[PDB]
């Protein structure tokens, strides 16, 4: 087995980790365990710290800022007498190879923390990846008040990720009935998806059934896969952006039924102009898929992403009320979009 | 200016049930992004191991993988009748992806000597205006051989194309076809055509010469 390592600009400090991606199982998260190699030759400040930081990065010309959401600090050197932690198997392997000079560090990620999400940049952006990202920074100083010198430190980007649940949810199904006043005639819309859990790049099948017992006519049927992003930092923000769509000219005449299966597949190639779109966290600048739906058990910081399919019937009423009163009929179907658990 | 792979084995040969190992040294570190493949002759390849050591589904338990820096390995616990094909080493960290040269894993058989037979040109070929002699070997192991024609009691080279068939799945033997391609006029003149074979099973070269 191999492990990751990164050194400070002048080499005096070297971090070691076992993996970059840490899985959030909701009930627990994979711990961030590692070691920091320090030589006595370059050990003058005589205090080495390690910090885990969950930060929201945001932007005029490529300038960015990091607001901390969760920060945790561990004093690797010296080992204070009032804190003795047992080493992980990964850590004890690392000391066995490196020696005493390697000082361990172990962070526990609490639940209800945001996952690593990167907001899509435009072609005219040169700054670092904006969004929510985790980061492990090891440095040495005389005390925590001292200003850390960029060369006496090292930072490594890590990600907090989730994977598809083992048990699939119930089949997403939804109904709605629009009843008009001119006559006692209902316009019924029923829609359903093939399954509850979908993987990225996989097709979504929307079964649509319309029972039009009214005098009006359905001119167009609009299907769309829409990404819901809830961003809770200061106050509140949120938006819906359609990662897939189809505008069928299928018509439902009065006093007639209609039934058709629409198949949509959300992918990034046709969404590269939608700046701010939620994507799965980027290590540095790697191309990543549409952000996976984050699952929360029972107002949580960071970017919370979900997905819904909207089926809208465009109706032309006319008659008594003319075109003043809208007669459109829509329904929505929530679903999960994330990657399978790597075996 | 591209990463190249160096499969160290060139023509591995082992008996059934043996533990065989194949190693490929990456020119520069490609990390654990290494895959191994199995390709039967006349068939498309199959995937065995991915990420260096992660066995793929639909692959036997015997297969397994490891890493030693630039040296990546492929180990089979017990060799099986199905597992007798040319294997490959790949890297997919940096584009373009590259493969190894190929290792001719084959069955181990007792050293049987070839049965050389020479065949004279047909009446149909010689009227067409061309001349060609076929020297044929059969049921021999190992596959290595060094046949060279001798015409008019003089060695002739540079005009002898050779072809070899795949190892038979039942008796585990090879065959070889040598062809002395020449014009019609050359055949009639200095007509002392012959083929001389040299093989491990044969203590002495056995020449099969034809006159008329």
């Amino acid at each position: 087995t191999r492990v990751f390592k990164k050194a400070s600009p002048n080499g005096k400090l070297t971090v070691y980790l076992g993996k970059r991606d840490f899985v959030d199982h909701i009930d627990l998260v994979d711990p961030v365990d590692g070691v920091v190699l320090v030589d006595p030759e370059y050990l003058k400040e005589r205090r080495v710290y390690v910090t885990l930081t969950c930060a929201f990065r945001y932007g005029v010309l490529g300038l960015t800022f990091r607001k901390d959401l969760f920060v945790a600090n561990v004093q690797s050197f010296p080992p204070a007498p009032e804190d003795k932690k047992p080493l992980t198997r990964l850590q004890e392997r690392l000391i066995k190879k490196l020696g005493e000079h390697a000082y361990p560090f172990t962070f526990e990620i609490p639940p209800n923390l945001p996952c690593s999400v990167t907001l899509q940049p435009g072609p005219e952006d040169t700054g670092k990846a904006c969004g929510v990202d985790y980061e492990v920074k090891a440095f040495l100083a005389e005390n925590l008040e001292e200003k850390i010198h960029k060369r006496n430190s090292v930072r490594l980007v890590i990600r907090k990720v989730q994977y598809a649940p083992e048990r699939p949810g119930p089949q997403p199904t939804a109904e709605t009935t629009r009843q008009f006043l001119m006559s006692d005639k209902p316009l019924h819309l029923e829609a359903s998806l093939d399954k509850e859990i979908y993987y990225h790049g996989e097709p979504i099948s929307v079964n649509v059934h319309v029972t039009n017992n009214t005098n009006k006519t359905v001119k167009k049927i609009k299907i769309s896969v829409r990404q819901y992003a809830d961003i809770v930092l200061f106050n509140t923000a949120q938006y819906k952006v359609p990662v897939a769509m189809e505008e069928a000219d299928d018509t439902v005449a009065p006093s007639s039924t209609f039934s058709k299966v629409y198949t949509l597949t959300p992918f990034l190639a046709n969404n590269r102009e939608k700046r701010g779109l939620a994507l799965d966290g980027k290590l540095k600048h790697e191309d990543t898929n549409l952000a996976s739906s984050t699952l929360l058990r029972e107002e949580i910081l960071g970017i919370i992403v979900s997905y819904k399919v909207k089926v809208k019937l465009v109706v032309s009423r006319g008659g008594l009320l003319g075109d003043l009163a809208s007669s459109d009929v829509a329904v929505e179907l929530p679903f999960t979009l994330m990657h399978p658990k790597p075996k | 200016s591209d990463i190249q792979m160096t499969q160290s084995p060139s023509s591995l040969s082992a008996s059934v049930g043996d533990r065989v190992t194949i190693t490929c040294r990456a020119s520069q570190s490609v990390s654990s992004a290494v895959a191994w493949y199995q390709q039967k002759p006349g068939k498309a390849p199959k995937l065995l191991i991915y990420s260096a050591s992660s066995l793929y589904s639909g692959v036997p338990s015997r297969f397994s993988g490891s890493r030693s820096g630039t040296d990546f390995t492929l180990t089979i616990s017990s060799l099986q009748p199905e597992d007798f094909a040319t294997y490959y080493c790949q890297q997919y960290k940096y584009v373009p992806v590259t493969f190894g040269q190929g290792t001719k894993v084959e069955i181990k058989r007792t050293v049987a000597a070839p049965s050389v037979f020479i065949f004279p040109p047909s009446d149909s070929q010689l009227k067409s205006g061309t001349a060609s002699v076929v020297c044929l070997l059969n049921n021999f192991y190992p596959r290595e051989a060094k046949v060279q024609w001798k015409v008019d009691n003089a060695l002739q080279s540079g005009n002898s194309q050779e072809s070899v068939t795949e190892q038979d799945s039942k008796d585990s033997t090879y065959s070889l076809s040598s062809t002395l391609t020449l014009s019609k006029a050359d055949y009639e003149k200095h007509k002392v055509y012959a083929c001389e074979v040299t093989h491990q099973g044969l203590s002495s070269p056995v020449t099969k010469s034809f006159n008329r």
Partner: peptide, 8 residues
């Protein structure tokens, strides 16, 4: 900037 791997 580059991050490298090593044996364990």
């Amino acid at each position: 900037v580059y991050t490298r791997s090593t044996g364990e």
